[PDB]
C-alpha cells in the first residue's frame, strides 16, 4: 500500500491513533545526503528529537498490516457507509 | 425472496437507526464539534 499518498497515511495514523511517526516526504527522503545532513531539517530530524520521521515504505507496510489485521463486519459498516455517502452534501 | 430481502430490511433498519441516533444526540454532537473547532483554532493561533 505504498502506492497511496502521504495525506492518506497521515489521516489513517491520526484516526486509528497508531504510534508510528509521520513518514518522510520523498523530497525529505532525498534531502538526507552528506551535505544534506547539515540543513536544519535533517539536523533536527535525526537524533534526540521526538519529532523524528521515518521512510514511507515502513509506514506503508505498518498501515497495510494494520488494515489487513483490522477485521470488518458488513452490518456495522455498510449502513454507516451509506449514511456517509448520503450525508457528504451536508 | 424472503431470505434475500432480509438483508435489505436489516440494512434499512440500521440506516434508520443511525439517523435516529443522530437526531437524538444533535445537541451534544454539535457542541463537541464546536468545542473541537474552537480548540483547533486557538491551537493554530
Amino acid at each position: 500500500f505504498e502506492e497511496y499518498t502521504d495525506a492518506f497515511l497521515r489521516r489513517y495514523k491520526d484516526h486509528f491513533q497508531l504510534d508510528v511517526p509521520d513518514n518522510l516526504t520523498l523530497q525529505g527522503y532525498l534531502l538526507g545526503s552528506k551535505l544534506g545532513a547539515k540543513t536544519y531539517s535533517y539536523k533536527r530530524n535525526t537524533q534526540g528529537q521526538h519529532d523524528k520521521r521515518i521512510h514511507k515504505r515502513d509506514l506503508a507496510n505498518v498501515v497495510r498490516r494494520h488494515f489487513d489485521e483490522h477485521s470488518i463486519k458488513e452490518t456495522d459498516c455498510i449502513p454507516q457507509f451509506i449514511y456517509k455517502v448520503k450525508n457528504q452534501k451536508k | 425472496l424472503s431470505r434475500k430481502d432480509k438483508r435489505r430490511f436489516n440494512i434499512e433498519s440500521k440506516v434508520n437507526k443511525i439517523y435516529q441516533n443522530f437526531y437524538s444526540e444533535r445537541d451534544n454532537q454539535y457542541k463537541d464539534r464546536l468545542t473541537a473547532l474552537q480548540t483547533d483554532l486557538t491551537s493554530l493561533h
Binding site: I78, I82 | K4, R7, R8, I11, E12, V15
Partner: peptide, 14 residues
C-alpha cells in the same frame, strides 16, 4: 426508502 432498495440490489449484485 426506495433508494435503499436499489443500493442493496447493487451490493448483492457486487
Amino acid at each position: 426508502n426506495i433508494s435503499l432498495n436499489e443500493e442493496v440490489t447493487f451490493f448483492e449484485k457486487a
